[PDB]
Write an enzyme that holds these catalytic residues in place. Structure first.
Site, PDB file in Angstrom:
ATOM      1  N   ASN A  11     -11.075  55.111  -4.015  1.00 25.15           N
ATOM      2  CA  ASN A  11     -11.217  54.788  -5.433  1.00 25.15           C
ATOM      3  C   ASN A  11     -11.597  53.317  -5.654  1.00 25.15           C
ATOM      4  O   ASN A  11     -10.972  52.606  -6.440  1.00 25.15           O
ATOM      5  CB  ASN A  11      -9.935  55.162  -6.197  1.00 25.15           C
ATOM      6  CG  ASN A  11     -10.084  55.018  -7.692  1.00 25.15           C
ATOM      7  OD1 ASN A  11     -11.137  55.315  -8.262  1.00 25.15           O
ATOM      8  ND2 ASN A  11      -9.027  54.551  -8.340  1.00 25.15           N
ATOM      9  N   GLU A  37     -15.846  57.576  -2.457  1.00 27.27           N
ATOM     10  CA  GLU A  37     -15.722  56.861  -3.736  1.00 27.27           C
ATOM     11  C   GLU A  37     -15.515  55.351  -3.547  1.00 27.27           C
ATOM     12  O   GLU A  37     -14.592  54.764  -4.108  1.00 27.27           O
ATOM     13  CB  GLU A  37     -14.620  57.490  -4.620  1.00 27.27           C
ATOM     14  CG  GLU A  37     -14.928  57.454  -6.125  1.00 27.27           C
ATOM     15  CD  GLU A  37     -14.049  58.381  -6.977  1.00 27.27           C
ATOM     16  OE1 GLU A  37     -14.045  58.220  -8.214  1.00 27.27           O
ATOM     17  OE2 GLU A  37     -13.362  59.267  -6.429  1.00 27.27           O
ATOM     18  N   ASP A 150     -13.196  64.701  -0.168  1.00 28.33           N
ATOM     19  CA  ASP A 150     -12.562  65.129  -1.398  1.00 28.33           C
ATOM     20  C   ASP A 150     -13.337  66.299  -1.989  1.00 28.33           C
ATOM     21  O   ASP A 150     -14.471  66.156  -2.441  1.00 28.33           O
ATOM     22  CB  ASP A 150     -12.483  63.941  -2.366  1.00 28.33           C
ATOM     23  CG  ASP A 150     -11.984  64.322  -3.746  1.00 28.33           C
ATOM     24  OD1 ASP A 150     -11.228  65.308  -3.890  1.00 28.33           O
ATOM     25  OD2 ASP A 150     -12.348  63.609  -4.697  1.00 28.33           O
ATOM     26  N   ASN A 152     -12.271  68.011  -4.540  1.00 26.40           N
ATOM     27  CA  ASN A 152     -12.005  68.034  -5.983  1.00 26.40           C
ATOM     28  C   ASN A 152     -11.462  69.360  -6.500  1.00 26.40           C
ATOM     29  O   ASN A 152     -11.601  69.670  -7.685  1.00 26.40           O
ATOM     30  CB  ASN A 152     -13.251  67.625  -6.791  1.00 26.40           C
ATOM     31  CG  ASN A 152     -13.159  66.216  -7.331  1.00 26.40           C
ATOM     32  OD1 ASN A 152     -12.126  65.806  -7.856  1.00 26.40           O
ATOM     33  ND2 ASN A 152     -14.241  65.469  -7.211  1.00 26.40           N
ATOM     34  N   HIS A 247      -5.685  58.741  -4.412  1.00 25.44           N
ATOM     35  CA  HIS A 247      -5.605  59.629  -3.258  1.00 25.44           C
ATOM     36  C   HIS A 247      -4.872  58.936  -2.114  1.00 25.44           C
ATOM     37  O   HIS A 247      -4.806  57.701  -2.044  1.00 25.44           O
ATOM     38  CB  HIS A 247      -6.997  60.009  -2.773  1.00 25.44           C
ATOM     39  CG  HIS A 247      -7.843  60.690  -3.801  1.00 25.44           C
ATOM     40  ND1 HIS A 247      -8.152  62.030  -3.734  1.00 25.44           N
ATOM     41  CD2 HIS A 247      -8.476  60.211  -4.898  1.00 25.44           C
ATOM     42  CE1 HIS A 247      -8.931  62.352  -4.752  1.00 25.44           C
ATOM     43  NE2 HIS A 247      -9.144  61.265  -5.473  1.00 25.44           N
TER      44      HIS A 247
HETATM   45 MG   LIG Z   1     -11.014  58.657  -7.958  1.00 27.06          MG
END
Ligand SMILES: [Mg+2]
Ligand SMILES: [Mg+2]
Lengths: 257, 255
Positions: A11, A37, A150, A152, A247
């Site tokens: 992130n 990300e 990820d 999602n 995460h």
């Molecule tokens: Mg994120």
DNA sequence: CGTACTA
DNA sequence: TATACG
């Protein structure tokens, strides 16, 4: 050779860096580090991140600045590195890294988030489809595959804390979970579920509600292997005490050569 | 007829809306409103903003979402509405609106901000150049012009509070002020300076330092006319009590 | 400091 | 709750 892969939605690479990402990176042994990300272009990154002692680094940023982007650090150099499926609209969001390590191809994927709009949810499911064809085409030619990142989407009601509340929320849509069903049905194994049957095992928690403290969470990050290669996976766990992102990282150990 | 045009960098149309933009718009009753930095696509705007009783609305958003964008509300309908100079890189940022009202073409421009990088400063000066050719081409061929919007540059040391400190800061670079010199030299008038010689008259203030309270500020927003049309400008003032943005609106009255 | 996008 | 560009 007992090899080690960590996958993590950071992130914001610059963000985790400021929270001491590099120190944790040295703390661990990881033979390959997959990041999702990162939200940066190589040039925007501090030199200490661009180059880590012992590792060869690869960055795939989205065209759109400060959005998406995946990264890979590796101790053993790959044969080659593909950055897209060959579909223009999917390849330009910096969601794809395919690295050939001979023994196996490594898929580092940041799958689209559908929560935002119905317009974007369409994109997610079509990404999934593009993904299957790609992974199958390579598995067809006989190559072993490791797919991380990820997704999602939580797969089963055990894979999150509030399943009934979220059945209408994207990330637990019946059409989404149905795809992972289809995905596994195509000859791929959720490496984590081979060793752990317990609920409460999650990888993402919402910031908005301080969820992580309760351990209300979702399992959105996965390691997958094709069942033919299934025999070589020794460990598949969740590094759930490592902070810095919404995460947590996930880990895979493979027994090789 | 006495016709009133307001220009304003709203710094987010949705944002000013939440601060009661429509109520001011109602109370001020301008004949044409020009807005810069709308920071939205028409689809994202509330219906009450998209259309206003008595006005025809035009929106020119940047391709890049939630960035830049200009808008125009008008009580008189135009013959045309060009949205670019004809240069791909300049037309895709939603910075240009050229509206034909027969008597005059109205330029609503959000000029690029150079502060961010030297890479973007290049873009600004080349925008300026593209702009002059365009405005000249139209005036040379017999049309009157009104140019309004955020130029992102104070012209003279009187046009801002801290000139000596900022001579190295973009928005007061010599390269920039030299262009406005050139611009005015090409037969265009800073309508504000026709009626007001005083310092301390500014249109933008920094949020970072609560500058507006001191009245430390810059004049970055201008109304310009070609000198041939200069006779018909009755008023040119700064609505400096209207809040909601880091810029205040500016006003022009014509005949 | 503040508006916007996206997660 | 937590990157970009003014
Ligand atoms: Mg994120
Ligand atoms: Mg602004």
């Amino acid at each position: 050779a007992v090899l080690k892969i960590i996958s993590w939605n950071v992130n914001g690479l610059r963000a985790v860096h400021r929270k001491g990402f590099l120190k944790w990176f040295m703390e661990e042994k990881p033979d390959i580090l997959c990041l999702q990300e990162i939200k940066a272009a190589p040039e925007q990154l501090p030199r200490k991140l661009r180059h880590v002692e012992g590792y060869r680094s690869f960055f795939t940023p989205a065209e759109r600045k400060g959005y998406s982007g995946v990264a890979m650090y590796t101790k053993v150099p790959p044969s080659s590195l593909r950055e897209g499926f060959g579909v223009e609209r999917f390849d330009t969001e910096g969601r794809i890294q395919i690295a050939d390590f001979d023994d196996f191809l490594l898929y580092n994927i940041y799958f689209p988030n559908g929560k935002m709009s119905e317009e974007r949810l369409k994109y997610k499911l079509e990404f999934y489809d593009a993904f299957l064809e790609d992974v199958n085409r390579e598995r067809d030619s006989g190559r072993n595959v490791i797919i991380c990142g990820d997704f999602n989407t939580a797969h089963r009601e055990i894979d999150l804390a509030r399943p009934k509340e979220n059945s209408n929320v994207s990330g637990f849509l019946p059409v989404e979970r149905a795809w992972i069903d289809k995905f596994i049905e195509n000859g791929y194994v959720d490496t984590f579920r081979m060793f752990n049957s317990d609920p409460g095992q999650y990888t993402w928690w919402s910031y908005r509600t301080r969820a992580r403290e309760r351990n209300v969470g979702w399992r959105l990050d996965y390691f997958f292997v094709n069942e033919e290669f299934k025999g070589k996976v020794k460990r598949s766990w969740i590094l759930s005490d490592v902070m810095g992102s919404d995460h947590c990282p996930i880990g895979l150990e493979i027994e090789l050569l």
